[PDB]
RNA sequence: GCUAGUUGGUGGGGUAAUGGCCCACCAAGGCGACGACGGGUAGCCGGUCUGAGAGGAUGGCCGGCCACAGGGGCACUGAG
RNA sequence: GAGGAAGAAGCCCUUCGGGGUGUAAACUCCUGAACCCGGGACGAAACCCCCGACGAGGGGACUGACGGUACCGGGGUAAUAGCGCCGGCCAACUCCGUGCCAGCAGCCGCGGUAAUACGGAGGGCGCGAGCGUUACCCGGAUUCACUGGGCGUAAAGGGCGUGUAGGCGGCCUGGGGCGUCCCAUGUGAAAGACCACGGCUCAACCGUGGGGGAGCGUGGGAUACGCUCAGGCUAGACGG
RNA sequence: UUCAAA
RNA sequence: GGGGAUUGAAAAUCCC
């Protein structure tokens, strides 16, 4: 059984991207959906959409990459170079607004879950709130 | 290990073993010579290193090195020990401080005099 | 006691001419003038590619020897520099340049720094009027460094203060050759000085 | 009883006292109840005596008994001046 | 134009009857101190030839370091084999805080302020290669921006 | 303020006294993980009111005896031996680890 | 594995005052793997040294608290 | 301190031409630690007395261990330099003497007739009233890895299962608000540390002022995630 | 046999 | 106990 559905999603994404898939499904949950909103708006994934597979609710995540490259290995650069889970079951991680991390001098992000909803480190910092530091992406 | 394991067992702190156990981890310790033998080194060296068994005030009886060109130590010379091994003589972990007590300083020494306890000679 | 011994030899070990004598170092004789190789029996022999360390050591030894300051004092200034806001490199230089003994020398009251130093130890110097014989005394912006009234007539004073007529001086300093007064206008910019020293390496030497 | 006296700070040949409120029984330089001023004997600074008079008046109102010297300094700052 | 800093020279040995048979390896960095560096590892019968060969290799294999006032756009860690390199950006006055290998590559890349740390195996050859990769991986806001748009 | 704690009654075997197990939760000072930890208080129940399995509030009080420094403030949730059970079992496992052992 | 004043109760004693602090009766209870009991070591803290930090190490001097006064017990006097 | 030889002597080295120590010395000229003479402190204004009213407020007087010290003004002499290193790490090299000897050695290692590693000398590097040695703490050491490590063959998967405690737990909704987060507020002694000015001629030392919060208590608030209570769901598990 | 020799 | 032969120098071996 999935012990960490969010970690599962994060990886499904990490895995699909390393072989350049178009989309990639992940069993749906509001919370996962919430994170995808951020991921989309931030511009890491083309976008996502609800989808029923075999009768069960999933989420097609349309990934995006850079342009074909020169020389040996033309495989495009990743838009999502890094995507790592922080807080986990049995080792939960929280932060006060004053402790929200600055992921790659801002060239990256951190998705936290606050009582004011799921926000990027910048968004949270703005509404002046902290919470569970879910993951970091860059 | 898992975080739960760490919460349960934690990490064990490293303990330091003293190399100069001649007690009180004091900087020096005085004793009395019992034997002023000569000993042979281990491969690949050959020579007659000067050594002395010392009945220490720390309740210990260890062997110390007698550094320098010749000494004046006998079966009853009171001496001060300082710690410092002799890589070549297994079991020799301390040195005898020349210039303290019955340990004369090296005579005719002109360079590293602090060590070997040799007073500054006069320059006429 | 700040070194005190064969000086036109340090110039030779740094392969660069340091002014630890003022004149004599201008007339073909600072030794660097025909005899620029290190002191000692091996001075003329070919050198070996110095270790990144050697390079950094000699650089610090250069800057330090220029002001005839001790390692103890030199280090204490550098640590102070680090702590302070702003680029440590310059700030460091700014501090070295603020030493009364150095300023005395900058204003021309003395030919070299070692002389400037002695002039201070012997009360021939004044800061805002009050006497000050501490060569390490830190001159602040706005201070007026002059010569003691009682010393203004000294033979050596006239000679040096005379040669100072017409002579220009530091853009951060100002000399009123008349009453033998001088004013520390402001801390010198790295751009203001031009010492044969890459302070960058010095910082690195202490970073080890 | 509780007092208003001088606690010694500064250094050798460089005294700098602190007008403080404290239990008579506490060591001179021990833990005081409140600092209500300072005093520099050699007046090496134009500001060698300061005294939170409003506060000084407070402790006196509740019992603080001042040292003779402590009283002297308070007076200078017009603590009892009832003009 | 291009500076040349020799990171290290070594004399390896091979075996044949009769005895040993030496060869020499040279790691040379080349840079313009203005955002361009290249690494080169050349081996040959004699040191000189080795160095040159290195320098030559160094010029092909160049990297475009996005300097931002003497520093890196952001922190990065790269592992090359068992060697790991940690590059952290810094404000001016800091300097190049690094081991001989990294600094040599950093200075010629025209980096003047940076926090560095060698982890894992400190094998110079691999630590140098880890560094090049780190730099090569550096991204600029404009770059990230370009990528995130679409 | 007088400290108020919530816990479970795991012992009604004393006259006018009940043992109250109180759970506490906190982040580990170095490893983060939220960890539980419990402690038993002997609370004062003069009316022999509360029983095994009740979830009562406990309040800081004037010493009643050695050990007893808390009085039962009120009942939060009656009956529920699941908690008591857990405690009893954990205690029974003790009968194990020693020179012999007990069935698992 | 530990426990008999041991855990709790009622009534007293005692104290400035709560309390097995002590006592007389009555209950069988209390504690422990979230480490009881036993052994070893140690006065605690503000702080100090080190370290990028997280940490690690330390508690002389100065300030706070505690404990002791050749080793054990006890009380009397007194606001103490 | 400044001047001071194409550069004394002596010692060292040499391809015997020369090279070092070296502007260093000598010597010339300046300044004047020490020391002598004179002056000579701040720290001490209260208590007390008198006026007033034993108050406020005014006046007055007695007190210095440190100390004839600090500091000031005259006069004024050229006037202590050591200690450790020079094979690599690690800045600094030559001769001679010793030979697996005598010895060196933090680690790797030096010495069995050409030793930059032993001892001495010349030279050099480093630091300087100090320089080395020993011991001990933290560092480098992500070498117990929270930040920040591992376990096929390098040290390391329990011989296997069953299962207790414990740790961990799929999708949707609701209540609660314990964790978590936000706002206020109390507490957080002084000293120390940090920043800024100041006082001793500087500094060390010291004074004044200024932020700096974590932890805990209280009072409000939020509810995404974790928790808990309710109710649902079949994609896990189990059953037919 | 030991140490060291390309 | 050297002092030789041998050795790169030893141990060993053969000599006085
Ligand atoms: K890799
Ligand atoms: K009772
Ligand atoms: K501590
Ligand atoms: K009066
Ligand atoms: K010889
Ligand atoms: K030598
Ligand atoms: K260590
Ligand atoms: K095994
Ligand atoms: K809710
Ligand atoms: Mg993942
Ligand atoms: Mg990733
Ligand atoms: Mg983490
Ligand atoms: Mg973390
Ligand atoms: Mg740990
Ligand atoms: Mg010892
Ligand atoms: Mg040998
Ligand atoms: Mg030596
Ligand atoms: Mg700075
Ligand atoms: Mg190679
Ligand atoms: Mg680029
Ligand atoms: Mg990188
Ligand atoms: Mg690896
Ligand atoms: Mg390693
Ligand atoms: Mg009962
Ligand atoms: Mg009772
Ligand atoms: Mg017990
Ligand atoms: Mg009672
Ligand atoms: Mg009573
Ligand atoms: Mg009892
Ligand atoms: Mg017990
Ligand atoms: Mg517990
Ligand atoms: Mg027992
Ligand atoms: Mg115990
Ligand atoms: Mg003890
Ligand atoms: Mg004690
Ligand atoms: Mg660390
Ligand atoms: Mg402690
Ligand atoms: Mg104390
Ligand atoms: Mg006692
Ligand atoms: Mg007592
Ligand atoms: Mg007693
Ligand atoms: Mg005694
Ligand atoms: Mg007694
Ligand atoms: Mg009394
Ligand atoms: Mg009494
Ligand atoms: Mg001279
Ligand atoms: Mg004269
Ligand atoms: Mg006075
Ligand atoms: Mg009196
Ligand atoms: Mg009257
Ligand atoms: Mg005088
Ligand atoms: Mg005078
Ligand atoms: Mg004169
Ligand atoms: Mg070297
Ligand atoms: Mg020889
Ligand atoms: Mg050596
Ligand atoms: Mg000194
Ligand atoms: Mg370091
Ligand atoms: Mg560590
Ligand atoms: Mg270890
Ligand atoms: Mg870890
Ligand atoms: Mg490992
Ligand atoms: Mg094996
Ligand atoms: Mg193995
Ligand atoms: Mg197995
Ligand atoms: Mg769940
Ligand atoms: Mg659970
Ligand atoms: Mg809920
Ligand atoms: Mg809450
Ligand atoms: Mg607070
Ligand atoms: Mg404080
Ligand atoms: Mg000042
Ligand atoms: Mg302050
Ligand atoms: Mg709600
Ligand atoms: Mg959570
Ligand atoms: Mg044999
Ligand atoms: Mg050998
Ligand atoms: Mg042979
Ligand atoms: Zn010169």
UniProtKB/Swiss-Prot annotation, chain B:
GO molecular function list: rRNA binding; structural constituent of ribosome; tRNA binding
UniProt keyword terms in alphabetical order: Methylation, Ribonucleoprotein, Ribosomal protein, RNA-binding, rRNA-binding, tRNA-binding
Domain of life (superkingdom): Bacteria
Annotated region (Disordered), positions in chain: 105-124
Gene Ontology annotations for the cellular component aspect, listed alphabetically: small ribosomal subunit
Pfam family name, one: Ribosom_S12_S23
Residue numbers of 3-methylthioaspartic acid PTMs: 88
Function, in words: With S4 and S5 plays an important role in translational accuracy.
Subunit structure: Part of the 30S ribosomal subunit. Contacts proteins S8 and S17. Interacts with IF1 in the 30S initiation complex.
Protein's recorded name: Small ribosomal subunit protein uS12
Lineage: Bacteria, Thermotogati, Deinococcota, Deinococci, Thermales
From Swiss-Prot, chain C:
InterPro entries: Ribosomal_uS4 (IPR022801), Ribosomal_uS4_bac-type (IPR005709), Ribosomal_uS4_CS (IPR018079), Ribosomal_uS4_N (IPR001912), S4_RNA-bd (IPR002942), S4_RNA-bd_sf (IPR036986)
S4 RNA-binding domain segment(s): 98-160
GO BP, one annotated term: ribosomal small subunit biogenesis
GO molecular function: metal ion binding; rRNA binding; structural constituent of ribosome
UniProt KW Iron-sulfur keyword: no
Cofactor binding description: Binds 1 zinc ion per subunit. In a number of structures (e.g. 4Y4O, 5FDV) a 4Fe-4S cluster is seen in place of the zinc cofactor.
Keyword terms: Metal-binding, Ribonucleoprotein, Ribosomal protein, RNA-binding, rRNA-binding, Zinc
Cofactor(s) named in the record: Zn(2+); [4Fe-4S] cluster
Pfam families: Ribosomal_S4, S4
Domain of life assignment: Bacteria
Cellular compartments per GO CC: small ribosomal subunit
HAMAP family hit by this protein: Ribosomal_uS4_B
Subunit structure comment from the entry: Part of the 30S ribosomal subunit. Contacts protein S5. The interaction surface between S4 and S5 is involved in control of translational fidelity.
Free-text function comment from the UniProt entry: One of the primary rRNA binding proteins, it binds directly to 16S rRNA where it helps nucleate assembly of the body and platform of the 30S subunit. Binds mRNA in the 70S ribosome, positioning it for translation.
Family stated for the protein in its record: Belongs to the universal ribosomal protein uS4 family.
PANTHER family: 30S 40S RIBOSOMAL PROTEIN, SMALL RIBOSOMAL SUBUNIT PROTEIN US4M
Official protein name in the record: Small ribosomal subunit protein uS4
Organism: Thermus thermophilus (strain ATCC 27634 / DSM 579 / HB8)
Lineage summary: Bacteria, Thermotogati, Deinococcota, Deinococci, Thermales
Curated annotation (Swiss-Prot), chain D:
PANTHER family: 30S RIBOSOMAL PROTEIN S16 (PTHR12919), SMALL RIBOSOMAL SUBUNIT PROTEIN BS16M (PTHR12919:SF20)
Protein function: Binds to the lower part of the body of the 30S subunit, where it stabilizes two of its domains.
Any Gene Ontology biological process: translation
Record-stated family: Belongs to the bacterial ribosomal protein bS16 family.
Pfam families assigned: Ribosomal_S16
Species of origin: Thermus thermophilus (strain ATCC 27634 / DSM 579 / HB8)
Keyword vocabulary terms for this entry: Ribonucleoprotein, Ribosomal protein
Name assigned to this protein: Small ribosomal subunit protein bS16
GO molecular function: structural constituent of ribosome
NCBIfam families reported for this sequence: S16
Subunit-level organization: Part of the 30S ribosomal subunit.
UniProt key word Ribosomal protein: yes
Gene Ontology CC, one term: cytoplasm
Gene3D superfamilies to which the protein is assigned, alphabetical: 3.30.1320.10
UniProtKB/Swiss-Prot annotation, chain F:
GO MF terms held by the record: rRNA binding; structural constituent of ribosome
One Gene Ontology term, aspect cellular component: cytosolic small ribosomal subunit
Entries under SUPFAM superfamilies matching the protein: Nucleic acid-binding proteins
GO process terms (BP): translation
Keywords on record: Ribonucleoprotein, Ribosomal protein, RNA-binding, rRNA-binding
Chain segments annotated as transmembrane: none
Parts forming coiled coils: none
Superkingdom of this protein's organism: Bacteria
Reported consequences of knocking out the gene: Increased generation time and a temperature-sensitive phenotype.
Matches recorded under CDD domains: Ribosomal_uS17 (cd00364)
PANTHER family, per the entry: 40S RIBOSOMAL PROTEIN S11 FAMILY MEMBER, SMALL RIBOSOMAL SUBUNIT PROTEIN US17M
Function: One of the primary rRNA binding proteins, it binds directly to 16S rRNA where it helps nucleate assembly of the platform and body of the 30S subunit by bringing together and stabilizing interactions between several different RNA helices. The combined cluster of proteins S8, S12 and S17 appears to hold together the shoulder and platform of the 30S subunit.
Subunit structure: Part of the 30S ribosomal subunit. Contacts protein S12.
Family: Belongs to the universal ribosomal protein uS17 family.
Protein name: Small ribosomal subunit protein uS17
Organism: Thermus thermophilus (strain ATCC 27634 / DSM 579 / HB8)
Gene that produces this protein: rpsQ
